[model samples]
Target: DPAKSAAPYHDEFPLFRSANMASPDKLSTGIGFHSFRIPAVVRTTTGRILAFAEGRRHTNQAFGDINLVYKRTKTTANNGASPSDWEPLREVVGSGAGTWGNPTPVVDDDNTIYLFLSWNGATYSQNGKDVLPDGTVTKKIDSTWEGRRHLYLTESRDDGNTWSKPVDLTKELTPDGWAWDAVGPGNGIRLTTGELVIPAMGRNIIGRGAPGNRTWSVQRLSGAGAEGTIVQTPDGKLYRNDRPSQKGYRMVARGTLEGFGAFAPDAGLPDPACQGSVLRYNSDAPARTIFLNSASGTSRRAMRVRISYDADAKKFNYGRKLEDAKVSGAGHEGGYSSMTKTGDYKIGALVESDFFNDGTGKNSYRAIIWRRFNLSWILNGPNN
Candidate 1:
């Protein structure tokens, strides 16, 4: 039976299932609004889990009216077992105007959930080589002094039930001379020392923000690259995996809390310049670090999950693909993914996937897939 094969390998198990289907919840497929993108999830200090995504309006492009959407679940038994376990889709930030993207969340010692985001005018898109058509960028981004993407912060004192008004922190946390910026399309981490670090772009480093103060310290990790995520190993070292603008292997850098060393190419992890998620699976005696990414360096379709037996997360020991036999292709499983440890001792991940084959095309339909699995599933895998 299938059960025999799964246990025989102990490393293999069919723990994945769909979290969000096409057009159903409160944020269901409606006129003007099309789909959801960028799934980022986190478990609160009270054991509540929140899954966040971008509510794409009109079209799937990143420029238009995009809202930071969220869904939460309190039941952790069997990894919430099915989609029914989750609450209805809710909008954390959006007013049918402008763009509120990047739901980067970090839980403080006091259980306060802080969300970091990047905001811009609804008409303003990423300032590419081609300038704006007409009036999108009212406040033209001055690369030499001002920034284009404004950073915002919102918090929920009562878990993910509600959120406070977003306060702009662009001037304080963001350094001078940055024209563009992004907090994270994933979740941030609270270091063992209680310091918080969020993944950011343009600077190629982690943005360390204090719980109460607005001022922050940024730890530089690499000379070039963006969309980086950080995780502290059991040995008290920090490891950052970054996505280079050009397609290639995921670059890695490691060092202590004081500072970090130079970044080098990590040939072991394949990527197509897409965002991936990392987690410190276990920090006890049998410590393990886990990584998730698009396995194929050339495409964003082959989603793979890997295990790092090394305490420092330097060497990846095992891996397995998160593919489907019925559905096959790049962008089908979506592009970006985020993972968190569930109260059930299972690894919970929110993965992006598209309902339409033409996900990259003009008209696209996308959603997040919540998946859960245990460390045994990773440890018993095919590789050592």
Candidate 2:
């Protein structure tokens, strides 16, 4: 008991507790928000933490009424250790029954945070089955013309306290040929050169948005891929770790502003075609990059965190699984995860956790877990 008391506790901060334990849905979060999905978190220039997710209305199914919601850490310190440190969840942007999702946030040098979201008409969903044979919607999304997936951007100059009305960026950002699209379900990285890179999906490209007059541009990185995280190496080259559509292995590409190289499968890290996140752990001396994902080649249960010394992510050394995933009754983890480095040399991760009727069954509950850990714990664990 003495030795156990002396040990440092690494706790998973329950951001959205369970279905009925923590908070109810009819409050400020969203109407009938049963569960939250798609975790995305970022540290502001001022050191404040902003966590974002989709407040699912009634079902865990991706195609339905969902809204963009967020919760900011009460204090700008040490990863918001206690549950009291995080404010209650609040809906950022949503109206009627439209689905506002993919909370890709990026804070500029001026401390202004810009959130990019994918807005689709409630009836027009990612699933073709959600639509009628004639292709109709119960409620038509307000657009210049009825579009498939429209892109929108909202900003907060005074941190997460207030936000400007979402400005439509579909005309400038989204291509005409794409029918379904999504921004990074995770956070975007600000290149040392000041370019804000947000990973885009409809065709697997990188969207370049800015803090100025809403100008935007996109470049195709790979012919096939989706849901990627972009990070810059100390050598000044860019690396993108993407989720391959094939569901076999992870694909990575490295390049610069001129152009990107071809995406190749990374045998080092095997995945189950789930969304993962990569962050530049340290840009200074002894630089390293941290990559997290469901390291299983078969299931979404083998969530592990690995450290890559090289920027290219070709060779990762310390691949360690988080504690929750190793336990039998910890529900299910390792689907979509986002990582941010706190100011206190700690890694803050918001990972997705799913609860089922049994080991594997129809969904029971879904939520996100805010995990905090140090480099030592990761290195001390098994190196998968």
My TM-score estimates for the predictions, one after another, are 0.85, 0.88
**Candidate 1, residues 1-384: lDDT per residue as tens digits?**
121134321111111212233334445443234667777888887788888888776556676677888888846343454656777677788865668988788777777888888887655567443223343444444453332778888888887899988998877777766766787768788878767777777342243455634245566545535577778888878887877677888888887767677888888887898988999877776677889988767888778778776867878854766663224321367478888888877778777776564546636666566677666565555543
For model 1, the superposed segments whose C-alpha errors exceed 4 Å read: 1-23, 28-32, 74-79, 128-147, 202-215, 324-331, 382-384
Residue-level lDDT tens digits of model 2 in 1-384: 121133333567568654644465344534557667898999988788999898877666565678788888887764678778888877788686768888888787778888888888767566544443244544433333464778889889887888888988887787765667778879777788878777777333343444533356777665546577788876888887888887888888888877788888889889899988988887665578888999877888788888877745568874678863342333566689999988776778888878764344324567778888777667656553
RMSD of each: 4.7, 4.5
Residue 333, model 2, lDDT: 64
lDDT per model vs. reference? 0.69, 0.74
Q: Once all C-alphas are superposed, what RMSD does model 1 give against the true structure?
A: 4.7
